[PDB]
Amino acid sequence: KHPNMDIAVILVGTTEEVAIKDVHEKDDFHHLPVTPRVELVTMQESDPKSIITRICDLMSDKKVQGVVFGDDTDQEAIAQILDFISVQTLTPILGIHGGSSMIMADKEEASMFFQFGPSIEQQASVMLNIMEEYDWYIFSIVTTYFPGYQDFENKVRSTIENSFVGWELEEVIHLDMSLDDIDSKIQNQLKKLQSPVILLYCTKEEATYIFEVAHSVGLTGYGFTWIVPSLVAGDTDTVPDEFPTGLISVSYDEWDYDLPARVRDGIAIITTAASTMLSEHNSIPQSKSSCNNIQESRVYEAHMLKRYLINVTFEGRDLSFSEDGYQMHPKLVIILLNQERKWERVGKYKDRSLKMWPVFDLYSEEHKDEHLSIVTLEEAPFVIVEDVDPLSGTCMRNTVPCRKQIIKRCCKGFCIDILKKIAKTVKFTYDLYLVTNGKHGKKINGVWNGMIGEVVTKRAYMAVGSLTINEERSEVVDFSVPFIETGISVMVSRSDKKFQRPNDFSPAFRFGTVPNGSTERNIRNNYLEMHSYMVKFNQRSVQDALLSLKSGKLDAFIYDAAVLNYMAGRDEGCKLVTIGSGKVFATTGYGIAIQKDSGWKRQVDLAILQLFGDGEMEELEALWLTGICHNEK
Amino acid sequence: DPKIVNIGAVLSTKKHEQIFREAVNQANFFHFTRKIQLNATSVTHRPNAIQMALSVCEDLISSQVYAILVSHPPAPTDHLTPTPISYTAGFYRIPVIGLTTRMSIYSDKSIHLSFLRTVPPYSHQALVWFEMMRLFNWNHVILIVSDDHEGRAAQKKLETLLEEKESKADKVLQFEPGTKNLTALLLEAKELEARVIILSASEDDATAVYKSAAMLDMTGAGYVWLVGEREISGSALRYAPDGIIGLQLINGKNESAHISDAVAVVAQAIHELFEMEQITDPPRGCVGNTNIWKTGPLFKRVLMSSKYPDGVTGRIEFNEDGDRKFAQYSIMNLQNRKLVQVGIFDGSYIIQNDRKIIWPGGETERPQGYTRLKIVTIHQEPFVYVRPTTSDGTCREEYTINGDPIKKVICNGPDETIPGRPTVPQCCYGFCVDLLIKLAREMDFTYEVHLVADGKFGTQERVNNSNAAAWNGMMGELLSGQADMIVAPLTINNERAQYIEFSKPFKYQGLTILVKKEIITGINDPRLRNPSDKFIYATVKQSSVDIYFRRQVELSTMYRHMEKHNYESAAEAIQAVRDNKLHAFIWDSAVLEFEASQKCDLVTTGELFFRSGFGIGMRKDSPWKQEVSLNILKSHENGFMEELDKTWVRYQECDSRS
Question: Which chain positions lie within coiled-coil regions (chain A)?
Answer without folding.
Answer: none
